[PDB]
Amino acid sequence: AIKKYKPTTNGRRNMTSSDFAEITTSTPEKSLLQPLKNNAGRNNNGRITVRHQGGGHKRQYRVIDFKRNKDNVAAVVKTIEYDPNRSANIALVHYEDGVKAYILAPKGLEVGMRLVSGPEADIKVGNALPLENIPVGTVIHNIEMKPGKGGQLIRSAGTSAQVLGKEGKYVLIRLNSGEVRMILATCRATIGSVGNEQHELINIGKAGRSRWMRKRPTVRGSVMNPNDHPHGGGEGKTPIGRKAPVSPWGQPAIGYKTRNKKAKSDKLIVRRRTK
Amino acid sequence: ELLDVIKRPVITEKSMLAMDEKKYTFEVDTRANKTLVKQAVESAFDVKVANVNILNVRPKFKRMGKYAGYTKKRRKAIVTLTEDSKEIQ
Amino acid sequence: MKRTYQPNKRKRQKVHGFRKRMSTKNGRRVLASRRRKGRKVISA
RNA sequence: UUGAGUGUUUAACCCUCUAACCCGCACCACUAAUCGUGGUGGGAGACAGUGUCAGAUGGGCAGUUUGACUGG
RNA sequence: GUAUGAGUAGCGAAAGACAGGUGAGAAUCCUGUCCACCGUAUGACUAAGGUUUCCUGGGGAAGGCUCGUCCGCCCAGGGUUAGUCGGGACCUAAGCCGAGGCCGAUAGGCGUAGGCGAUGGACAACAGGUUGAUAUUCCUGUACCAGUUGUUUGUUUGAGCAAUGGAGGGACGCAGUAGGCUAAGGAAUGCAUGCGAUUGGAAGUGCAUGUCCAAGCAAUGAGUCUUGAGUAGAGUUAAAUGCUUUACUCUUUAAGGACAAGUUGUGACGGGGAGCGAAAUAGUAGCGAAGUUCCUGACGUCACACUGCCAAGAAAAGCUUCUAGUGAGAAAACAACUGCCCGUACCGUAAACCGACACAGGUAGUCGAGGAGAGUAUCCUAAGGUGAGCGAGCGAACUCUCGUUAAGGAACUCGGCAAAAUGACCCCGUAACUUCGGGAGAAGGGGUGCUGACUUCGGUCAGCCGCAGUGAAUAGGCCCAAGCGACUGUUUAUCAAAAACACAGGUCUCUGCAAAAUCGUAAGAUGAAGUAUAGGGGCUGACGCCUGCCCGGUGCUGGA
């Protein structure tokens, strides 16, 4: 649930947080962590290519199985854990050979289930199958877009897609955001929707907590000088003395579309709905 | 090369006191070992050696006649004996 | 009241020394222009 | 660069194929390797990318111009 | 090159005085005595940095804001000692370099294998003595680590050794209290000496001084952490008796296993120790008493051990196992031998570093005592350091820094600017308003020293003295109203700290992943080891109530 703080300081008045009640341990598996660095938005060359990033808390990377390739061997669920790198929770899983792995935690996963990962698997939450073998109207997450590469699509906290129909060598899916699309019928996905979903309702509360997450502050274009922004300059507060407010590099900012007009995937997109 | 290694003895007031505990001071070559000096001394006098000690000495700024520059570098080794003696004067 | 020059031995050799001047093509332009003038010290 | 077949209309157009071209897909060898090169599948395909020419748009950026008389 | 201003400004925070030495010459150098200053530092140790400034014997032309017999200055000689400390012959982070490679008018840009690179990991010695100048380096005593020589059975493997392979391990955040030990501190038992010449004191209750010790080895140990076994199977690229794991069965205050500050012996018939003190130039050589009890007690160490939280907290080698394995026969006794290169002086809250200066500035880390105190605050002091590189007189105007002031009390000035006033602890009390937390130390008042008695305990009663009892130093003035910005934060190094910027929250829009966006000719990158509850761009700016009318014009989107 969402936890509400009492207003004991001015920096506390309207903050909320997670209860962390689906999490069952706080000590990760040692053989599945690697280091990370916090690039802070800088390049190959040492230059800022993305503004407003840098300098929070240190993190170790957990390796996830986005492929789901170990078939005809059940895996038991041992823990539901905290990941610093994503917004979903994560599950430690014991295969019977004794391989260990991490997995994205779907909605309603209990410690103790036994998941299966092939074409003859059942339709239960957690199970992963090729899209050919999934009926019409099942809620789905963690979708491959190329055979054998790993799920890419429905991965963040509380998201889901749905199966609409089949044809020759393609399956129709309605994704999160409402776009309709085609995906190869030999790709995989796992049954369920992603888990921790109150995540959306958290109120950060003060300027220090979003500094703990690795975000640096943002200055508005219109309190700059005319050599920094197209919006800078003028005596006093000023309006947008232009048509169409723009980015620091020109490029209009309300309603102007920026995807590639000769995209090699415009064959597969039915019914653009939201971007 | 065992005969270019030892250069000469040091004869100062701090080194006369060492000759009374069976210790001898020599300016040795730069690029010489503790072990190489030990071999050379055992070869050139027929003694038995316990324990060479070794130091480096920095050059000194000097200034004679509106022309200044440094003296040489130096290497000083102090050789201790078990029981025998060398007579230098 | 902290002034600009704060001495350090490693930095002076790593930014201005002989090997740093030898590793670029413009460092060797510097070394040749100093040898052509008669400098007694061509590289820090 | 760039190939092949059918059909629909007055040449153009909608298509289908697979061998070029592409792959920030998988497995294999050089091999200590998430680079690279070869090999086999899969995907995509005469499209895309790249060269020469042409029409738009373009203070994002550049070089300049913005007269004289005059009880100042 | 030389004048004028002119023998004028200044001589860079601070306590000295006298006696005697030396000498051509002394306020300024030496020796003494008393006085004064710092003491969470102006004391002790060290990493940078400097680079001979360090010690001894001479000197006085220049440097030293005066002087100089003196010196961090000048001349001559001399000083730095390591198997164990810090670095290399060990490991890796960021970043850097990169055989082949990929890109590109040239020059060149990037990057794979593999390397370099500590500010981190790993890693065997202590206590005392000694010089004019070095000491975990020399010496004394007693150790430890890695090797070498000698004297004390089928390389199949049941001897031994064993991987560039399989595994285990190393291996990690912030806050908060509690416990245990030791360092450090205080007051009285033991010592040793000696009795006041200004009124008084031979002392169970009187003055001054002192009141202990290592590494290693052996014994144990305040305590802390962790369940353990059996069978049937997966697996671990070949093999494993090693490791991971699924299912079942017994087991749980238990048993087993692991780690542990310290303490007591030995080391030690040794060392140090108040003082005593020579044969000569020596407080010198040398000779030495005593080692107690009680109170207080560390964020030092056990130890990031335990608890709680969210923002979720390096890598690699040494190390330890298991086999695969070219593969006579090496285990452990004693003895005696071997063990390389670089640094090591001295300054280091400073006259030796950064500031052109012997400059009122700046400089990482450890140690940092007593009384009264919560304290590293405050005042006075201990161990230690210092009297600060121009002086002697006088005691005018004026300028600066300080102390006091009759009567009045903001009449001053742009403005109570600047001063004065409040200030500690204990007790009583305390409004409107409010987001229910606050407002609040609201406001306003009272107590405080010393002796005796009782003290249930914490205090209360009786008495005494002064103008005054937190008798010094240190420590909120408050109240009633209105504008701006919710708030903590940030800003014009060097005339502007704010009503400006940011902010949590709102809303519009772009983006289906080789994402949009940005660096770049490209290769390659960030975004992101992310995937629409995600990432970019514009405006507004907690929270409460709300956010009207217009699509003609201009942009944007869709059309045909």
Author numbering:
A (entry chain C): 2 to 276
B (entry chain U): 2 to 90
C (entry chain 4): 1 to 44
The authors write:
We purified 70S ribosomes from E. faecalis strain OG1RF and analysed the complement of ribosomal proteins in the purified 70S sample by mass-spectrometry. Structure determination by cryo-EM using multi-body refinement produced molecular maps that reached 2.8 Å for the 50S subunit, 3.0 Å for the 30S body domain, and 3.2 Å for the 30S head domain by gold-standard Fourier shell correlation. These maps were used to generate models for the 30S head and body domain and the 50S subunit. The final model of the E. faecalis ribosome includes 97.6% and 94% of 16S and 23S rRNA nucleotides. Ribosomal proteins that are less tightly bound and those in the L1 and L7/L12 stalks were not included in the model. The overall structure is similar to other bacterial ribosomes, as expected, and ribosome functional centres are well conserved. Motions described by eigenvector 1 of multi-body refinement include an 11-degree rotation of the 30S body with respect to the 50S subunit, and a 7.5-degree rotation of the 30S head with respect to the 30S body. Motions described by eigenvector 2 include a stationary 30S body and 23-degree rotation of the 30S head with respect to the 30S body. Motions described by eigenvector 3 include 3-degree rotations of the 30S body with respect to the 50S subunit, and 22-degree rotations of the 30S head with respect to the 30S body. Inspection of the amplitudes along eigenvector 1 suggests that the motions along this eigenvector are likely discrete, whereas motions along eigenvectors 2 and 3 are likely to be continuous.
